[PDB]
C-alpha cells in the first residue's frame, strides 16, 4: 500500500485489462494503464498502473466499468483518485482506483 490517496490529473487511459483476484475467488480485477498528458516518457506518471474490484456474484457492468470503456475508447483526460491500497497487475504493484472524474478544463485539471 501507499500512505495516502493520490490525485492524478490530465490522465488518459492508454490500455485496459481483466484478471482474477488472488485473495477472493468471488471477485476479480478490472485493470489498466493511465498516462499524464505532456509528461516525459522517463517519468513514472507516463505509465501509471491501476486496478479496481469487480463483484463476480453480481451480474452486469459496474459504473466504473461503464465509464472506463467509454473514456478509454474516447481517450478522455481524467482526474483519478488512486490508493491507498495496492493490488497486483502483471506481477508488479498497481494503485486501487476508487473514484474517477473526466476533466472539464484547466480549473479541475491543471
Amino acid at each position: 500500500d501507499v500512505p495516502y490517496v493520490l490525485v492524478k490529473t490530465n490522465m488518459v487511459v492508454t490500455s485496459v485489462a481483466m484478471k482474477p483476484y488472488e485473495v477472493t475467488p468471488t471477485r476479480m480485477l478490472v485493470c489498466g494503464i493511465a498516462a499524464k498528458l505532456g509528461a516525459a516518457a522517463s517519468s513514472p506518471d507516463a505509465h501509471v498502473p491501476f486496478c479496481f474490484g469487480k463483484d463476480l456474484k453480481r451480474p452486469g457492468s459496474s459504473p466504473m466499468e461503464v465509464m472506463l470503456r467509454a473514456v478509454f475508447m474516447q481517450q478522455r483526460p481524467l482526474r483519478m483518485f488512486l490508493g491507498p491500497k495496492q493490488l497486483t497487475f502483471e506481477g508488479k504493484p498497481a494503485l486501487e482506483l476508487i473514484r474517477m472524474v473526466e476533466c472539464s478544463g484547466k480549473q479541475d485539471c491543471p
Binding site: 490517496v5 490529473t9 461503464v66 480549473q107
Partner: protein, 197 residues
C-alpha cells in the same frame, strides 16, 4: 458563476484517514466550505486543539486556529490525519414529477466505488443539468442496467437527447458544480415535437 453548496446535513459525523473518504462520500472543497456559513459555524463549534484538517484542494485550520480556510492543490493535503467528507446522496422530499431538459449531450463522466455513474448534460457548451444512475442504491436502481446502455451509446456517439430526471434525490458527486445533479430516469433520442420525447 455560482456553485452548488451541499447543505450542512451532508457532512459526515467523523472525518476520514489517508485522504480516503468512505464509499458514497467525497472530499469537501475550499469553495464549497467558503460558500457555506452553516458548515463554517458547525466546524468552529465541534473542532478542538491546534488541528488542521484536509479539504479536497486546501485545508481547514480549526480549533485554536479560529477556523481559517487555506488554498492548496487537488489532494495536496491528503497526507494529514483527517479529511472532511460530504455524503453524495440526499433525499430531497420533492415529488416524483417528471423534469426534462431538451437538446442536451452527455459529457464529463463520473464514477466511484460502490456508488453511481454520472454525466453532465450540456447545451451550447454550457452545463444544463447533471444526472446519475446506480444499481446499488436509490429509488431507480432497477433502471441502471437499462440506462447505462442508452447513456454509453449517446456519450460515445455524441447524440443530442432529451434527458429525464427525478428531483426526489439530489447528488453532490461533482466538486464545485455550477449545475444541480439528480436521479436519471430517462433518455430520449427523438424528433422535434415528438410524443416519444
Amino acid at each position: 458563476p455560482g456553485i452548488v453548496i451541499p447543505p450542512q446535513e451532508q457532512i459526515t459525523q467523523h472525518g476520514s484517514p489517508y485522504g480516503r473518504c468512505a464509499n458514497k462520500t467525497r472530499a469537501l472543497t475550499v469553495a464549497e466550505l467558503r460558500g457555506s456559513g452553516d458548515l463554517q459555524e458547525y466546524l468552529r463549534h465541534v473542532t478542538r486543539g491546534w488541528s488542521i484538517f484536509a479539504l479536497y484542494d486546501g485545508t481547514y485550520l480549526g480549533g485554536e486556529y479560529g477556523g481559517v480556510i487555506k488554498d492548496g492543490t487537488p489532494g495536496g493535503a491528503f497526507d494529514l490525519k483527517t479529511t472532511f467528507c460530504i455524503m453524495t446522496t440526499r433525499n430531497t422530499g420533492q415529488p416524483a414529477t417528471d423534469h426534462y431538459y431538451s437538446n442536451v449531450t452527455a459529457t464529463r463522466l463520473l464514477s466511484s466505488t460502490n456508488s453511481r455513474l454520472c454525466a453532465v448534460f450540456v447545451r451550447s457548451g454550457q452545463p444544463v443539468i447533471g444526472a446519475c444512475t446506480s444499481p446499488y442504491d436509490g429509488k431507480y436502481w432497477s433502471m441502471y442496467s437499462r440506462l447505462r446502455k442508452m447513456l454509453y451509446l449517446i456519450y460515445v456517439a455524441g447524440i443530442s437527447v432529451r434527458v429525464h430526471v427525478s428531483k426526489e434525490e439530489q447528488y453532490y458527486d461533482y466538486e464545485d458544480a455550477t449545475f444541480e445533479t439528480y436521479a436519471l430516469t430517462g433518455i430520449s433520442i427523438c424528433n422535434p415535437g415528438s410524443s416519444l420525447c
